[PDB]
């Protein structure tokens, strides 16, 4: 009753990559002879939870028959007399007594993280025990160490070295029909019907790293046994998976919306000129990045926007997350602002570090007047001031690689609180004021809502749009919101 190599799919590229560093030091070690070099030991896996890090560790152990070992994160961390430093070297000599062997250290960020916070506890001397333990592994082709974590930036950078932990690999998200392989594993034991199809499930499940897919087929079985009031032939149906989509949340309990708000290109009313200029954003240079290396110049870094509120600074700001389906993030203005004074510069650091790590990505900003603050702090006198929040992002956004899909886009309502160095070229180049729509573009503003509702064709579409003589794009949503409560009126 153990798992194998065929037990998990979707990560077939990462499966064949990780199988080289475990089989070749153990099965055929003669390739490292007469070539001079030494076979490496550490393999580093990292990703979001629910991706199958411990599942991949147990699958490679039982398929080779090696001496598998397990070292847990919060388990071996003692405060008695330094017993964690004696139990780490106890696990290394026990793995050295049996050949071949493999150890596994999950949640390695929990054991001795980076010293930006603690810096004085016993964890400083815990990690240095692990430095001399892995470097003293002169026994060739015996022990192979693998690790798993969730945040590669919280760990100390001394582990990412030649000897102990090199050759890191990121277990990504199975988006390219990888959820079909997960559905082939889990639903092969359940009894199925003719109406179900696994190809019509992966196209609608954005994200879905794999743990919620196993929860989706179990919850679909709960809907099938719900109608049985209580010889038995239940099966499944297509409506059970559609019931499990709406009545169960995806991996969004930590943050509410990070992916999209389910919009498209034609959901903003009018503004066909900014739809053309949005094709010079990250849609353009991803599929051809060698043209800028041929032409020898960096592409555009940032486009800025400012104008009247309610003209498309949330619809078009989230339409970039749907036209390429990149690794979107959602962050508010004063939500970046923290209560601590020392966190005032590191909170923009981890956001920008996730942008270069989740390439290609889409970031945005709202209400930069709380962030720019062109005077540079109001009065002073305090233990902390409002001056490091703007002077850090103006330099960190310059210290980014051009070929890493990093950019910014703006959405403000006050053109005077923003600093002149905020609107600097090279950081925010195109000073584009968003305009109020004219009479030629305010017809498709109402049509952005009439695409989904069945409007009667006898009603004139331009008769309600002709009442606008200088209105905004959100004001015609107020009419269909007023008509949302004025249409029924008799069906209570």
């Amino acid at each position: 009753n153990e798992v194998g190599y065929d037990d998990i799919g979707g990560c077939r590229k990462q499966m064949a990559q990780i199988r080289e560093m475990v089989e070749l030091p153990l099965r055929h070690p003669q390739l490292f002879k007469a070539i001079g070099i030494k076979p490496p030991r550490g393999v580093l896996m990292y990703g979001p939870p629910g991706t199958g890090k411990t599942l991949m560790a147990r699958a490679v152990a039982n398929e080779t028959g090696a001496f598998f070992f397990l070292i847990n994160g919060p388990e071996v961390m003692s405060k008695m007399a330094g017993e964690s430093e004696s139990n780490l070297r106890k696990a290394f000599e026990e793995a050295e007594k049996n050949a071949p062997a493999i150890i596994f250290i999950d949640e390695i960020d929990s054991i001795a993280p980076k010293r930006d916070k603690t810096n004085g506890e016993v964890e400083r001397r815990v990690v240095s025990q692990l430095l001399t333990l892995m470097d003293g592994m002169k026994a060739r082709s015996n022990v192979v160490v693998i690790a798993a974590t969730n945040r590669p930036n919280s760990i100390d950078p001394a582990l990412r070295r030649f000897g102990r932990f090199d050759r890191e690999v990121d277990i990504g998200i199975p988006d390219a029909t990888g959820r079909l392989e997960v559905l082939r594993i889990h639903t092969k034991n359940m009894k199925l019907a003719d109406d179900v199809d696994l190809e019509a499930l992966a196209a609608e499940t954005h994200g879905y790293v794999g743990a919620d897919i196993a929860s989706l087929c179990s919850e679909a079985a709960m809907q099938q046994i719900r109608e049985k009031m209580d010889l038995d032939s239940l099966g499944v149906t297509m409506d059970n998976f559609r019931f499990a989509l709406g009545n169960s949340n995806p991996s969004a309990l930590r943050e509410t919306v990070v992916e999209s708000v389910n919009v498209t290109w034609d959901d903003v009313g009018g503004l066909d000129e900014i739809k053309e200029e949005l094709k010079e954003t990250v849609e353009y240079p991803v599929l051809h990045p060698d043209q800028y290396t041929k032409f020898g110049l960096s592409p555009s870094k940032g486009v800025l926007f400012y104008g009247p509120p309610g003209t498309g600074k949330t619809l078009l700001a989230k339409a970039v997350a749907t036209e390429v389906s990149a690794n979107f993030i959602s962050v508010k203005g004063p939500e970046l602002l923290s209560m601590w004074y020392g966190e005032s510069e590191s909170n923009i650091r981890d956001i920008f570090d996730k942008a270069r790590a989740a390439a290609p990505t889409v970031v945005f900003l709202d209400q930069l007047d709380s962030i720019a603050k062109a005077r540079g702090g109001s009065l002073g006198d305090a233990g902390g001031a409002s001056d490091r929040v703007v002077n850090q992002l103006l330099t960190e956004m310059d210290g980014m690689n051009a070929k890493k899909n990093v950019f910014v886009i703006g959405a403000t309502n006050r053109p005077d609180q923003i600093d002149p160095a905020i609107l600097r070229p090279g950081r925010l180049d195109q000073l584009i004021y968003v305009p109020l729509p004219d009479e030629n573009a305010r017809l498709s503003i109402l049509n952005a809502q009439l695409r989904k509702t069945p409007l009667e064709p006898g009603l004139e579409l331009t008769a309600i749009a002709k009442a606008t003589q200088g209105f905004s794009g959100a004001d015609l949503l107020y009419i269909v919101q007023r008509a949302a409560k004025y249409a029924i009126k008799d069906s209570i």
Binding site: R58, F67, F68, F69, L70, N72, R89, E94, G136, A139
Partner: protein
């Protein structure tokens, strides 16, 4: 590998301690929260409540199985039950490949904390008859010098101690030794050559050398007082010279265990001493040695001191590297932390106690060896009971020249009488093996008539009648 039949029975039983409902329980009747949960058999809090001072090693094996085997994957079956080593690994897995040039901390023996062992192998030594060891003290009453012996016995379960093994002894064999008033010291070569043939007859009789006894009496005035009181709280419990003889006897007889990596661990050996009580009698006591520290350092570093409570620690000569030994004791003002930067460290700390006793005379399971306990023993040359075939006319004689089988078989089950007959090897070894099995086992009446109808027993009584 196969262990003993007694050791495998203690492993299968869990030995849990049941508890009842209480006022502190807030749960329902069909459950248990913490106060009526089943108690583990290795908790030392329940042990000292019933005045049990050790945790019954088979339960200590269970408390390390919970640390070895977990709910997680593991896939190891390590079972870390091994002898902790104080010797120095020569290869050392580092750049200091010779010990003459180089030693680091991963191969250096750590400083001995001198923590007492919480588990004993044998939990309670028991005896068979008070007339058996009465002959052993009677040897001192005739020659006035100290004696020595070896105890042959078996093992079975013990229901008083939770998951405990009790030690049963059946007979006592005495090796030839040179007695002395102060102490005793014999040659180990003639004893080992003599003990090799006794182990041959002990296999068919179902016996095993698992113990030894030595006497220490110092009679006061031979009138109203029985003996002096040498061993008390202020004096030594065991002399350091007898720790050496107890340590070599445990290493010669290992105990087989499947959980150990080397194949043998936790030797079941008893050392009993006749010393006398505090007030007025000759009551005996027994302690066995500790496995954790004393059992391995006796191969290289134990040296004799002039004090009976302590033993000297000698120096290192190019291979015999020893660590520092520390213990806590009170100074002239208060109680202080470890002081020992000085030799002659005490050896009474490295002994774990036992509970000796004699069973009730009204009932028992069996006794298996009570024939006379008055036959002259094999190697009692200091006493007058070392006779030739003149004794066989006096002892058994096939009683009154025509013996009843209820009165003849009761004398033939003696241990030293059967060990004296086969040394002459008149009978065949096949007929001798059924002779000793008839005397030690039940339903002997059908097989005793087979012995008297054989021509070998007829030649034994015919060659005895013509001789004196």
């Amino acid at each position: 590998i196969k262990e003993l039949a007694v050791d495998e029975e203690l492993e299968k039983e869990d030995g849990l301690i049941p508890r009842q409902k209480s006022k502190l329980c807030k749960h329902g009747d069909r459950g248990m929260c913490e106060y009526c949960s089943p108690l583990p058999p290795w908790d030392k809090e329940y042990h000292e409540k019933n005045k049990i001072k050790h945790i019954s090693f088979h339960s200590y094996l269970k408390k390390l199985n919970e640390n070895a085997n977990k709910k997680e994957n593991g896939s190891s079956y390590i079972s870390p039950l091994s002898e902790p080593d104080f010797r120095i690994n020569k290869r050392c897995h580092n750049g200091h490949e010779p010990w003459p040039r180089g030693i680091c901390s991963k191969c250096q023996p750590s400083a001995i904390t001198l923590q007492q062992q919480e588990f004993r192998m044998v939990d309670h030594v028991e005896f068979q008859k008070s007339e058996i060891i009465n002959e052993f003290i009677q040897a001192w009453r005739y020659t006035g010098m100290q004696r020595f012996g070896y105890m042959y016995g078996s093992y079975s379960k013990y229901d008083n101690t939770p998951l405990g093994i009790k030690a049963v002894v059946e007979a006592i064999y005495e090796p030839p030794q040179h007695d002395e008033q102060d102490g005793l010291t014999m040659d180990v070569e003639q004893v080992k050559n003599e003990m090799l043939q006794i182990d041959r007859q002990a296999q068919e009789m179902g016996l095993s050398r698992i113990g030894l006894i030595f006497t220490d009496l110092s009679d006061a005035g031979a009138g109203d007082g029985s003996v002096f009181c040498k061993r008390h709280k202020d004096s030594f419990f065991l002399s350091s010279l007898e720790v050496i003889m107890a340590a070599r006897h445990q290493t010669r007889h290992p105990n087989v265990s499947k959980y150990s990596e080397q194949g043998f661990f936790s030797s079941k050996f008893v050392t009993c001493v006749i010393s006398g009580n505090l007030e007025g009698e000759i009551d005996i006591s027994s302690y066995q040695v500790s496995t954790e520290a004393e059992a391995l350092v006796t191969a290289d570093m134990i040296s004799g001191s002039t004090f009976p409570s302590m033993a000297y620690i000698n120096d290192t000569t190019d291979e015999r590297y020893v660590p520092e030994i520390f213990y806590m004791k009170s100074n002239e003002y208060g109680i202080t932390v470890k002081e020992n930067a000085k030799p002659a460290f005490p050896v009474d700390y490295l002994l774990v106690t036992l509970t000796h006793g004699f069973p009730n005379t009204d009932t028992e399971t069996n006794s298996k060896f009570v024939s006379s306990t008055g036959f002259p023993w094999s190697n009692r040359q200091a006493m007058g009971q070392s006779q030739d075939y003149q004794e066989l006319k006096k002892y058994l004689f096939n009683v009154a020249s025509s013996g009843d089988f209820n009165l003849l078989h009761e004398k033939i089950s003696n241990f030293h009488l059967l060990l004296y007959i086969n040394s002459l090897q008149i009978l065949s070894p096949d007929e001798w093996k059924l002779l000793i099995e008839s005397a030690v086992k039940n339903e002997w009446e059908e097989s005793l008539l087979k012995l008297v109808s054989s021509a070998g027993w007829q030649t034994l009584v015919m060659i005895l009648q013509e001789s004196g």
